[PDB]
A paper describes a structure:
DT homologs from Streptomyces albireticuli (17% identity to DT) and Seinonella peptonophila (20% identity to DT), despite showing no toxicity toward human cells, display significant structural similarities to DT sharing both the overall Y-shaped architecture of DT as well as the individual folds of each domain. Moreover, each of the individual domains preserve their respective folds: the central split β-sheet motif in the catalytic domain characteristic of the ADP-ribosyl transferase (ADPRT) superfamily; the three-layered α-helical translocation domain; and, the Ig-like jelly-roll fold in the receptor-binding domain. Additionally, both DT homologs maintain the pinched disulfide loop at the junction between the C- and T-domains. By striking contrast, we found that AT and PT do not display any measurable toxicity on Vero cells even at µM concentrations.
As crystals of the DT homolog from S. peptonophila were grown in a condition containing potassium iodide, a 2.2 Å dataset was collected with native protein crystals at a wavelength of 2.0 Å to maximize the anomalous signal from iodide. The structure was subsequently solved using iodide-SAD phasing. Whereas the homolog from S. albireticuli (S.a) displays a Tm comparable to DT (46.5 °C cf. 48.25 °C), the homolog from S. peptonophila (S.p) is significantly more thermostable (Tm = 59.5 °C). Of note, however, AT and PT contain both Cys residues (C217/C231 and C239/C251, respectively) that bound this region, and the crystal structures confirm formation of the inter-fragment disulfide bonds. In ATR and PTR, the 16 amino acid insertion between β9 and β10 contributes to an ~25 amino acid “lid,” hinging at ATG550 and ATN576 (PTP571 and PTD596), that folds back over and occludes the presumed receptor binding surface. By contrast, in AT and PT, only Y54 and E148 are absolutely conserved: in both, an Arginine is seen in place of the H21 residue; and in AT an Asparagine is seen in place of Y65. The T domain of PT contains three His residues: H272, H276, and H364. Two of these residues are structurally equivalent with His residues in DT: PTH272 ↔ DTH223 and PTH364 ↔ DTH322. Rather than forming π-stacking interactions with a second His residue as in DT, PTH272 forms an edge-to-face π–π interaction with PTY296.
Residue numbers in the entry: 4 to 606
The structure:
């Protein structure tokens, strides 16, 4: 009856993983039962309970270690916390469900009806516990499931991308009710703890940022290593069901080799040891620098003779000359390392060549050759990046950032096909659209009852964009309610996914005049390519003020929308946040910094 597929799952691996924010590290002690967080934020909202809606509160665990590691940051500041392996009880029932209703998202009443129809609800009749109890908050979904000793396995409305061959790596999330978690779930291992401080809530906003700058380095390297270990085992090992015969590359070695070669070839030629006062912006001079040292980089990179370099003198020089224009109006004392790498994404695909894909023969040498050549020439065009605080050289930050960007899009594995989308909008060669016409474009604030709401949209390179277009995805905004109990963000459920990785993001609510809105920013530079589209889940809770109590009810926020920024964030903005792209008067276009995607909110 209820278009939901329900399956009882027998697990083979009972150890799952949980990323925690700095304030939640104290709740996870190895060898102890899990502690349900009693901490609250400044508004009184719980932190670490899985949702602001009690129906969906629980211990959310990821099957894969590298997915959970992406969650282990403080939402507002991005300070990394800790990562833990936890053991699930074997005496309970694991129930995977899948919504097959394209017109309606999952609700507590729908799920419990589907579970009753399969003979899974043992303790209550339909008269004792049905939708009327959930709609009146007399009973809550996950708490009732915990008494039934049920752990939910959930894929939501978007699981993972399918590649061009038709292969889809499964993504599983465990929703463990808190009564099961605190009584039967144990912390098996402390994988890694980054936050060593005392009372994170005592820190003010300033010193939270200082802590993040100290810890973002180690956390980035651990996360990348986790994702590289998963890719090697599941996607690269030929004996794995999900292998495609790909020639996977050692991207950590590629980074260190590219950085060593750039440093050596720069420190041996004073011509390449340029300062900001004698930067080279002429395309012709930059082409000669390419052609003078490309044969030397060929030998140092062990590139086989006859194997084509994925770069050309012309494209690298135009890209570098263009970056000199945009970097020209910037100061070194206020330029972030991550901002510099994000700023080289525009134009990167036309010049580097391996951002969209790399050949399966001599690939490791081609990658080192491309990154080393690109970093060498760009270092001459924008020498200001060598003056950033704590950079040892312009060529080293450019080579390291380039290798990091290219590794993130996995050019040595098959590309991903974007899901179909609805009501698309396009700006600056970037298209966004809702994943489901009826579920995502129209949010019902009060039916079945006020509470948790989420919708998905996809980010992709536009159809008519030039080949190899790469775009920086630097910010995601979402309209919120101007008054309380209308539309508030649920940052625990905001979710960004690219390739097979979760993109770590800060989430914060900002108030400008009478407007409230969410600001979601990836913690590390994020590059959109045709091979790696991006899916975003935006999550909210509605309330008793979401709509009016009159004959023709209007609902708030009015003119709801999300917006994706596709250009580097400005270094010259007085108020840091511009609410402009969320306003319905905003015009999507060829040169717009944002692409705005509106939706509707009714009863």
């Amino acid at each position: 009856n209820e278009s939901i597929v329900v399956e009882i799952v027998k697990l083979k691996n009972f150890h799952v993983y949980r990323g925690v924010s700095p304030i939640g590290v104290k709740d996870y002690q190895v060898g102890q039962k899990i502690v349900k967080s009693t901490s609250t934020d400044e508004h009184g909202n719980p932190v670490g309970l899985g949702n602001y809606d009690p129906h969906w509160q629980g211990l959310y665990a990821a099957e894969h270690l590298h997915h959970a590691a992406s969650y282990a940051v403080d939402n507002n500041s991005g300070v990394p916390g800790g990562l833990f392996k936890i053991k699930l009880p074997e005496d309970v029932r694991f129930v995977r469900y899948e919504n097959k209703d394209a017109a309606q998202a999952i609700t507590p009443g729908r799920l419990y009806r589907a579970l009753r129809e399969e003979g899974l609800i043992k303790l209550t009749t339909a008269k004792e516990l049905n939708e009327t109890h959930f709609n009146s908050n007399q009973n809550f979904l996950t708490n009732e499931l915990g008494k039934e000793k049920i752990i939910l396995i959930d894929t939501d409305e978007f699981e993972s991308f399918t590649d061009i061959n038709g292969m889809k790596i499964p993504r599983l999330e465990f929703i463990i009710p808190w009564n099961i978690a605190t009584e039967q779930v144990q912390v098996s291992e402390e994988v890694k703890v980054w936050y060593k401080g005392r009372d994170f809530s005592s820190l003010n906003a300033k010193e939270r940022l200082e802590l993040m700058m100290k810890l973002r380095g180690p956390y980035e390297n651990d996360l990348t290593s986790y994702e590289a270990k998963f890719k090697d085992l599941i996607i690269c090992r030929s004996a794995s069901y999900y292998s495609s015969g790909s020639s996977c590359l050692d991207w950590e070695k590629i980074k260190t080799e590219s950085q060593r070669i750039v440093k050596q070839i720069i420190e041996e030629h004073p011509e390449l040891q340029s300062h900001s006062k004698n930067a080279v912006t002429d395309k012709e001079k930059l082409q000669k620098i390419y052609n003078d040292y490309a044969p030397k980089i060929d030998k140092l990179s062990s590139l086989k003779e006859g194997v084509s370099r994925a770069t050309t003198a012309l494209n690298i020089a135009s890209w570098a000359a263009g970056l000199a224009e945009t970097f020209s109006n910037k100061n070194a004392d206020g330029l972030d390392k991550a901002a510099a790498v994000t700023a080289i994404i525009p134009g990167l695909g036309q010049a580097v060549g391996i951002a969209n894909g790399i050949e399966k023969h001599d690939g490791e040498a081609i990658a080192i050759n491309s990154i080393a050549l690109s970093a060498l020439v760009v270092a001459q065009a924008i020498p200001i990046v060598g003056e950033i605080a704590d950079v040892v050289g312009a060529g080293l930050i450019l080579a390291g950032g380039l290798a990091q960007l290219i590794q993130s899009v996995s050019p040595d594995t098959p590309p991903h096909v974007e899901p179909p989308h609805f009501y698309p909008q396009t700006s600056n060669h970037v298209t966004v659209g809702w994943l489901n016409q009826k579920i995502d474009e129209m949010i019902h604030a009060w039916y079945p009852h006020e509470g948790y709401r989420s919708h998905h949209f996809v980010i992709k390179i536009a159809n008519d964009a030039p080949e190899n277009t790469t775009m920086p995805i630097t910010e995601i905004m979402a309209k919120l309610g101007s008054q309380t109990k209308q539309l508030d963000l649920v940052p625990e459920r905001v979710w960004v996914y690219q390739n097979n990785n979760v993109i770590t993001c800060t989430k914060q609510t900002v108030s400008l005049k009478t407007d409230r809105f969410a600001v979601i920013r990836p913690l590390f530079p994020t590059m959109l390519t045709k091979s790696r589209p991006i899916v975003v889940r935006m999550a909210y809770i509605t309330g008793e003020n979401s709509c009016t109590t009159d004959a023709n009810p209007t609902c708030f926020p009015e003119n709801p929308a999300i917006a994706v920024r596709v250009t580097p964030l400005p270094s010259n903005n007085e108020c840091e946040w511009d609410h402009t792209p969320l306003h319905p008067s905003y015009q999507n276009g060829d040169k717009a910094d944002f692409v705005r995607l509106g939706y509707r909110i009714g009863v």
